[PDB]
Amino acid sequence: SMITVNEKEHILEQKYRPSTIDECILPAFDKETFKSITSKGKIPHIILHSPSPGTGKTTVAKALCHDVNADMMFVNGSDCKIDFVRGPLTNFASAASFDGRQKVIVIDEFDRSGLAESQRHLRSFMEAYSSNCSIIITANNIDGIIKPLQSRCRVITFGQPTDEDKIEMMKQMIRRLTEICKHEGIAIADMKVVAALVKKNFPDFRKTIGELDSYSSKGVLDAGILSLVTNDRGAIDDVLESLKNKDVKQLRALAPKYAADYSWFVGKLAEEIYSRVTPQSIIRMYEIVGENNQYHGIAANTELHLAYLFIQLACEMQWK
Amino acid sequence: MITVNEKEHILEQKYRPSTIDECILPAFDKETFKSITSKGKIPHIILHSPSPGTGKTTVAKALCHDVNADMMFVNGSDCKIDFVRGPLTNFASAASFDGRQKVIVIDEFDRSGLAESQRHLRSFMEAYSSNCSIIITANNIDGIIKPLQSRCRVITFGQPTDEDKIEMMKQMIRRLTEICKHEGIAIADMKVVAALVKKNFPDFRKTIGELDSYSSKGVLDAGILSLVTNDRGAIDDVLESLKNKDVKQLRALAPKYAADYSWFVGKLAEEIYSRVTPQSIIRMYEIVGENNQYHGIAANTELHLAYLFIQLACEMQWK
Amino acid sequence: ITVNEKEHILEQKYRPSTIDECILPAFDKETFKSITSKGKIPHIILHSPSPGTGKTTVAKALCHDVNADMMFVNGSDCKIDFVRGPLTNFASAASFDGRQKVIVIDEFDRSGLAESQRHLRSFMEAYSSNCSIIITANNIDGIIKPLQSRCRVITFGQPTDEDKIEMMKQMIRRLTEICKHEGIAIADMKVVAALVKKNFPDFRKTIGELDSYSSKGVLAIDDVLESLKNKDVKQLRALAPKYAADYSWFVGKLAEEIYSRVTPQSIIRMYEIVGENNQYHGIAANTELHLAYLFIQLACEMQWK
Amino acid sequence: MITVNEKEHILEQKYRPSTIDECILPAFDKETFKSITSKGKIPHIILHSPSPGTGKTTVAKALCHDVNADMMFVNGSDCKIDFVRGPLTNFASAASFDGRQKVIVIDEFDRSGLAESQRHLRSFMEAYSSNCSIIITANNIDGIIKPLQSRCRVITFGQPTDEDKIEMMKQMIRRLTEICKHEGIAIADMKVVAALVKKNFPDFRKTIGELDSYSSKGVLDAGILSLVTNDRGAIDDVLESLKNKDVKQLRALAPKYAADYSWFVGKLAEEIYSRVTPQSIIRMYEIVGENNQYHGIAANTELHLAYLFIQLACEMQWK
Amino acid sequence: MKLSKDTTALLKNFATINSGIMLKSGQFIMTRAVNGTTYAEANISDVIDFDVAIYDLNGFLGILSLVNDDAEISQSEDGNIKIADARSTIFWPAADPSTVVAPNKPIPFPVASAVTEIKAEDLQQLLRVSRGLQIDTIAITVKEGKIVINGFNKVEDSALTRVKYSLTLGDYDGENTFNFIINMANMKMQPGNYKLLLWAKGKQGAAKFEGEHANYVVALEADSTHDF
Amino acid sequence: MKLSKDTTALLKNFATINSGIMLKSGQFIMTRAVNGTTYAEANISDVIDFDVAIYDLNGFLGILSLVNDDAEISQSEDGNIKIADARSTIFWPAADPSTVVAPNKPIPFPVASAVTEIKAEDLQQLLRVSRGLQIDTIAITVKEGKIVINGFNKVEDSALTRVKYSLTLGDYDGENTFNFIINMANMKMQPGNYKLLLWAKGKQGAAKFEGEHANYVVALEADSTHDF
Amino acid sequence: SLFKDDIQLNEHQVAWYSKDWTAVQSAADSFKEKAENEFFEIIGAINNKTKCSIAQKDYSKFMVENALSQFPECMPAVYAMNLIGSGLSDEAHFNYLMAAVPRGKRYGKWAKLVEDSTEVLIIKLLAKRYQVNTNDAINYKSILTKNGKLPLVLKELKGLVTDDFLKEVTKNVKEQKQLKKLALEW
DNA sequence: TTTTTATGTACTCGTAGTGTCTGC
DNA sequence: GCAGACACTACGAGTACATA
Numbered sequence A: 001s002m003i004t005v006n007e008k009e010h011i012l013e014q015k016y017r018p019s020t021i022d023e024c025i026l027p028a029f030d031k032e033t034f035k036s037i038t039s040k041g042k043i044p045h046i047i048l049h050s051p052s053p054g055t056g057k058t059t060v061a062k063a064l065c066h067d068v069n070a071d072m073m074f075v076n077g078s079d080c081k082i083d084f085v086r087g088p089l090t091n092f093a094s095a096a097s098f099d100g101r102q103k104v105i106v107i108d109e110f111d112r113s114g115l116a117e118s119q120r121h122l123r124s125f126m127e128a129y130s131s132n133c134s135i136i137i138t139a140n141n142i143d144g145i146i147k148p149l150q151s152r153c154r155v156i157t158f159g160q161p162t163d164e165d166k167i168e169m170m171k172q173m174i175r176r177l178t179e180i181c182k183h184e185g186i187a188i189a190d191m192k193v194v195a196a197l198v199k200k201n202f203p204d205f206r207k208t209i210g211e212l213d214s215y216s217s218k219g220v221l222d223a224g225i226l227s228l229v230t231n232d233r234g235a236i237d238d239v240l241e242s243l244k245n246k247d248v249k250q251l252r253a254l255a256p257k258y259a260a261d262y263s264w265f266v267g268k269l270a271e272e273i274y275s276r277v278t279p280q281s282i283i284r285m286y287e288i289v290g291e292n293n294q295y296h297g298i299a300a301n302t303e304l305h306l307a308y309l310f311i312q313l314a315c316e317m318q319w320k
Numbered sequence B, D: 001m002i003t004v005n006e007k008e009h010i011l012e013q014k015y016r017p018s019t020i021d022e023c024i025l026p027a028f029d030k031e032t033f034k035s036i037t038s039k040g041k042i043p044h045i046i047l048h049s050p051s052p053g054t055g056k057t058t059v060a061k062a063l064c065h066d067v068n069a070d071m072m073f074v075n076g077s078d079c080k081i082d083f084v085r086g087p088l089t090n091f092a093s094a095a096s097f098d099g100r101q102k103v104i105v106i107d108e109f110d111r112s113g114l115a116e117s118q119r120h121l122r123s124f125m126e127a128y129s130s131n132c133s134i135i136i137t138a139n140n141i142d143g144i145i146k147p148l149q150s151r152c153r154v155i156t157f158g159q160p161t162d163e164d165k166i167e168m169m170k171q172m173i174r175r176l177t178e179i180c181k182h183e184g185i186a187i188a189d190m191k192v193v194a195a196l197v198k199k200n201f202p203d204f205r206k207t208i209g210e211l212d213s214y215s216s217k218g219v220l221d222a223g224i225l226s227l228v229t230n231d232r233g234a235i236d237d238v239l240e241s242l243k244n245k246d247v248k249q250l251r252a253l254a255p256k257y258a259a260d261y262s263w264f265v266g267k268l269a270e271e272i273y274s275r276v277t278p279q280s281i282i283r284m285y286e287i288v289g290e291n292n293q294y295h296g297i298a299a300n301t302e303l304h305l306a307y308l309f310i311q312l313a314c315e316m317q318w319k
Numbered sequence C: 001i002t003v004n005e006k007e008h009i010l011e012q013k014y015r016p017s018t019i020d021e022c023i024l025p026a027f028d029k030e031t032f033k034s035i036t037s038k039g040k041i042p043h044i045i046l047h048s049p050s051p052g053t054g055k056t057t058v059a060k061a062l063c064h065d066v067n068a069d070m071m072f073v074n075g076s077d078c079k080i081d082f083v084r085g086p087l088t089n090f091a092s093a094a095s096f097d098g099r100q101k102v103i104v105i106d107e108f109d110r111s112g113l114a115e116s117q118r119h120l121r122s123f124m125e126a127y128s129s130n131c132s133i134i135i136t137a138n139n140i141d142g143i144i145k146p147l148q149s150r151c152r153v154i155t156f157g158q159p160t161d162e163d164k165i166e167m168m169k170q171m172i173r174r175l176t177e178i179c180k181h182e183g184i185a186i187a188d189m190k191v192v193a194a195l196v197k198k199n200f201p202d203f204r205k206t207i208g209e210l211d212s213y214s215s216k217g218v219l220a221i222d223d224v225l226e227s228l229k230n231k232d233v234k235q236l237r238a239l240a241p242k243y244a245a246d247y248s249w250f251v252g253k254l255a256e257e258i259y260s261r262v263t264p265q266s267i268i269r270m271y272e273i274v275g276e277n278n279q280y281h282g283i284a285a286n287t288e289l290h291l292a293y294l295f296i297q298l299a300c301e302m303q304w305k
Numbered sequence E, F: 001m002k003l004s005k006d007t008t009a010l011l012k013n014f015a016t017i018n019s020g021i022m023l024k025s026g027q028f029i030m031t032r033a034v035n036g037t038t039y040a041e042a043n044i045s046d047v048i049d050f051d052v053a054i055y056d057l058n059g060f061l062g063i064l065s066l067v068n069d070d071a072e073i074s075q076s077e078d079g080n081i082k083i084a085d086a087r088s089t090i091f092w093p094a095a096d097p098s099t100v101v102a103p104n105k106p107i108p109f110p111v112a113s114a115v116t117e118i119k120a121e122d123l124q125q126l127l128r129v130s131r132g133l134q135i136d137t138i139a140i141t142v143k144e145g146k147i148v149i150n151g152f153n154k155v156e157d158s159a160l161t162r163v164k165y166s167l168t169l170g171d172y173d174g175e176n177t178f179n180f181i182i183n184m185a186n187m188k189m190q191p192g193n194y195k196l197l198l199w200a201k202g203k204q205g206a207a208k209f210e211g212e213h214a215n216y217v218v219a220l221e222a223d224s225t226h227d228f
Numbered sequence G: 001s002l003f004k005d006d007i008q009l010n011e012h013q014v015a016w017y018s019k020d021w022t023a024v025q026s027a028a029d030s031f032k033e034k035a036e037n038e039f040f041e042i043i044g045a046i047n048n049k050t051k052c053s054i055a056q057k058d059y060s061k062f063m064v065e066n067a068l069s070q071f072p073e074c075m076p077a078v079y080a081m082n083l084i085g086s087g088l089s090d091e092a093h094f095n096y097l098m099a100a101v102p103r104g105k106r107y108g109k110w111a112k113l114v115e116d117s118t119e120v121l122i123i124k125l126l127a128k129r130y131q132v133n134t135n136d137a138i139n140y141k142s143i144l145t146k147n148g149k150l151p152l153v154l155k156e157l158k159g160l161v162t163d164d165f166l167k168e169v170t171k172n173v174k175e176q177k178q179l180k181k182l183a184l185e186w
Numbered sequence H: 001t002t003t004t005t006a007t008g009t010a011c012t013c014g015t016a017g018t019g020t021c022t023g024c
Numbered sequence I: 001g002c003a004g005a006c007a008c009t010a011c012g013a014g015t016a017c018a019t020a
Ligand SMILES: Nc1ncnc2c1ncn2[C@@H]1O[C@H](COP(=O)(O)OP(=O)(O)O)[C@@H](O)[C@H]1O
Pocket: C010, C011, C012, C014, C015, C016, C021, C022, C023, C024, C048, C050, C051, C052, C053, C054, C055, C056, C057, C058, C136, C203, C204, C207
């Protein structure tokens, strides 16, 4: 196949972790800049950061090493305190690999705040040992990497594709998910649900696979799963009609019905009213719904908070 | 069938479900848990409510029970970074010697000051993913950092479909009935049992906790039914003090109804609607709606109620 | 009647000892009897919000009646490291006479403690077999929702017209008895009936009052209220941090005390100003500053009688 | 003219300047360093940026090189009190046997936990001032205790005059050009070299580090210029749809950036600040700040983002 | 009154159990924690000559290692204290009894459900295994006829299942079954030979440690389990 | 299976290389540091009768001093490590191999570029001095037909400019010339006489000490230089 | 003092050459000189409408908000960043303040209250013995003068003044004038 | 020209106290 | 053989950062 499987793992977003830089699904310019790097055979100091999780930062870190055939120490960022850098990393960085391999230190998830002291200590280290070995830092949030370490690196920024990349990357990820299903014994009844999972959590490829596990309970993905993935469980007609008619007892009665799950309902209402009302009623309807959504969760009685939203819209909406 | 712990008198903990089936859950949710216990291995999972007592931390223990995991159970707030470095790293690296899935249940992990520990955990979860998995239980998700939600299957509770709600309620009524047989509680009117369930729906803990308090007299009769459906009273003393536009009286009634606000605020909307003129209605929703909206930012809730009364007193034209 | 003779303050050395000695609503007293009967005590919350209704008294009484081994704790002292340390010790240790263990956390309302309260939510389930918790609160919203889920929330304050008339009689008898013990001379019984009626719901202040009469043995907010009238600022700016400490109580007193001291349409303005300030507290990031802002607002708009 | 180290591939460290002239600096600064190397003896000095890669630690080694000092180079974070008592006291007391100024270079000495070492150093500097001098390098001065700044000539970097900036940039362009000849990098459009310099100005390290990554194809042409002046993520589609006050478009972009909100909201503040009128700034912070504040209470996050857009569309008066 | 080299060491030791103490006239000291978990009594050969309350103990024993050993600790002329020295004089505060938690209950351990001994060198081995093998609870019970101890790890091994440690303490002859569990935290004795008397009826109970230099009694944790 | 003083003194050594260890049945044991810098192999007195992974070596060895010098050991029914004593008994958590960075097998050593030998008497003086002289790294080169060794102070030194020490090992028969630098830190061997095996295929390069008990390999330093 | 010709070696030279580190230390301790900040050039720019641009210098949302918290002309703007500002970029919180609080001047003195150090110790004491929080504790003291004679109770509690407890009250040898002060006049 | 909120969590430094083991 | 001297730990000081 075209796909690495680790087979020591059941957890399945980790079974399918890409082995090499090509197996990785990335923005065009980004993949190309990584090929360029593996080509020159030596690896500079690099930072990979999302801030969206699961874009492939810590996967590409291991792949880069794999492609250049580095001698690589992989390290949990939160474990890398100043005494670690002084002790084991200084050892590794000064020691000579005997097979003339680029030495590389991968510090994963290095953006914690209490490591600033370690990071500063590292700034002088990186210039001393730059001849042997390079450092690849992985971070969710850059501002947790001190500025002088960004100076020292090529900062590559993830999950920020072009409009075309997004369209291609999505196709690639759909093909991949399809392939994972063949292997896994997951039946695909409606391809539309696979395109939906991808689109739903786009930048994050980890959650996108994680999802597939949880919607596979029944070994099939059919039109019924598609309802839960897009899921709208929604027809709004009784409210939309009671709104136009500007009646209230009815609105007052419908409140408790949809208070049940609010975040979904409020969403449909925005989507559905948009089409049914005049142009400067649109701008008003976002101001009214937006504000109402905003305070939900401070508001103590949620059913009343829904009633309050209806009254507001009934009066200010002028229906085309 | 029903599991009883018998080391506990406290009775919402006596009847805590042992296995995934004994649990009352939405259809798709139960099914997704069966699916999981089937495959025999357990992924990294987050269970969150935000409504308490939906069964999150119960289903956590049950999942472990069904897959026969070697499980360390841990108070979230006790779970600081040095804990993860020390005891959890030990457990996660050690090999269970019967070949059991190792699982770490971190209960109520949504505290703010643990973000540092959670980040530290993000690299851990990938290192030890082969041995053991983590089940996190949270009331509020935003207290779990994003990269941990990335790493998990986030299952969201107490948000059933309309059908699930109807089934779950039936199941919970059957269960309460069974708990009563065991406990020596006499059921005179079944209508009171269906009432307790409906009253606090998402929360199954409070729904059983209630049963303890209305059992003082070992029987549930039509008389208990009045107290279960019952009151919060009428609103008359407030509605009158409002019309009269007097204050000392309003100022005095504030503390009375501060007790349960969300209910009171609801009655007030319902009852004033009828008693005031048409464009006073539109004003009364803006006044009550806004007041309800900030409650829970507002620090002194009794004062917040007074503030509502003063506002209505002045702007309400009464029929 | 019940006396703790080593206590030098009136409210500490007279507190009703048992659930019966307490003056309460009928259904409330009966629910407490019911509880003491079953011999074991569940997790409970007692809340007013009106002070001196007997919350923290009934807490000790419940324990007394079931003969619990009880640790009593100031709420504001119960931070997360206390729950981890001494309370975890107590809750895990087994009382050696087979007594219900009970932890009374008094005045647990302030959300300085929300972090502690959450930590508690997992705790309560872990050691529910040994020991139960009784929380006392003036304002409920200061108790996180998942702790209310775990408890029986009992609420104070809605006496019937008859209860009020009986309770007042009972309190008058009680005050009389306190006077015999204390060496306080009652020349006119009318003054005793007056003290009771004057602050009715609040039995604490009604006894605290009696002490004030104490100096001849026969029968506050000022610094802010003054600095407000004077419309000065440096002083208001300085007082802010003082009362930022516990806001929900302070704001309460300010409403109560200004009401009397200011003109009629200044009252309506003062509720709009304090109400709005109270309302956003807890979105507002710097709470000392938020108190300053309230002061500036009142200084300008208030007309004192 | 250009020093190349040839033991390094990493290329911003290949071209590290050997001597004080090879260094690209403000006029007065270069001149003050020439002045120093002339007198043949080196005083106690502090070089600080706070902008990284302005050449502090490079000029440190160069100053030594020019005066031909016997120099110990030391990582700041490694220089704890026992080091100063130990290794440094030895070196500072020992006599160089060619009659060379002895110099101790402490690089990146601005760490907080070294204040104890720094104080210990204040007495040392006066005791051994006859032998040897100290050159401290720091990103943030306030991390250097006051009595050490008293004892030094504090020279402050990367904060050139408007003229220096214009000269320094020309000098850096000439240098990059020369690095390209040596490296086999073809320059098709000189405009792209002037662009790399301007883009990252204070930081000369990143400006060279960039050249490595845009050289994948061995040529710098008009096509690379698009990527150098271009913005790879950006905000443009939103900023534009905001100005145009259109909605269907704003309504559509909402779900795009709801993905990671805390970052997006940040960019929007940063980017709108420049593009809108002065009292629109004050309004935009109130609008964005409030929206950011309730995020995480707000249940539908995509809607909450739409709400933010509608708000800014109307109230933003664009310069 | 004067306080010896051995008395003061049962005073640093009773500080690990209460911030404050109240000893009174006699040759007897005793204290127990503000959380009623832990009781410790000890008969000293220095005869305390009056009734005193100290808010803090481990503070006092400090101003006492300095003074030489004459230390006629008498009572100050205004209710506080006087540490008389070979050549000085010091004044410690003395707390109103309302500010110290004192046992007040020299209740007598009922009768032993079962008795057994432990050698001091073998308290040694356990006080130390638990440190680095990470134990925080133990359980005293019957294995193969003798009475054993198990160390566990309440956190890692949530329900006392995998035993990290066992120790054999000389046979039980009586015919009963039991499992007495103690939270290591609430265990604070300086080593030594100790008679072990453990009592419980039904569910209420405790363990009493008889030692030649002090006595110790603590509470079974929540779940202990027997048939007495 | 039991272990003697001599065995353990070894493993307390192998601890300082990798804080964990994986070991299986035989009279062979081995560990290599996590970071890929050193490695030791050992033939020993005592005999291993089952495979097992130890996470915390440096403290297991510790637990072992906490019982008699004879207690027998084995794989528990509990698939963990049972250290059983005369009176007591311990149960040490056997860790998942996944996590103990061990070497799959044994890689042969390139028939050596250069050979010479070193007296253990001699090597004690190197370590001995190095404390005394703040000697942090060394270099082994050829000075006038003999194999020397030079200690430096990479700290104060920087460029390895000045020699602070210089043992004198064997003579150099062959006709290359080199300079193999070694991080003192990376030199974790129980003292005793060694044969020395040097090797380099250009940028490749390592160093092997051949003991009577175990063999040790350490990585040269980044600019170890040579004409091989 | 022999030899009788030593160009005096400075306090330092002796510390070091003789290599007793305890004397070297107190020579170190010599300049501890603790002060820092320059946060008032940031406040100043927000006020005077000069240009700083921040970024480079450390910023304190607490320190900038509090400083301005002084002059009522500002409170509207600070009030704002107080409700809303939690969660804004320091870069932002700064940019805002530049474009809101308009005039410029302020002179120094903040308002800090006057603590009667004694009165605080007394309330802190009462709240300890009585397991009440500070406001009732103040009520108790008001009450406890006007009868029941505060000396009666301060005499009982003089028991716990534990010098850990004093560190909670004041920060200097003012703190040792207090150990003695309630050990006395009751 | 002015100057630091309260709770909880995490990390580095120096030093002092603590314990196990070896050379003349 | 025991001191000496080494290696390790516990603690207090100062810094920091996210919440309210
Ligand atoms: N129901 C009651 N009966 C008698 N006295 C009461 C009652 N409630 C409060 N008190 C008086 O108030 C004091 C204790 O107040 P407390 O129970 O703390 O009130 P709260 O909980 O409202 O703060 C006691 O001194 C007691 O005399």
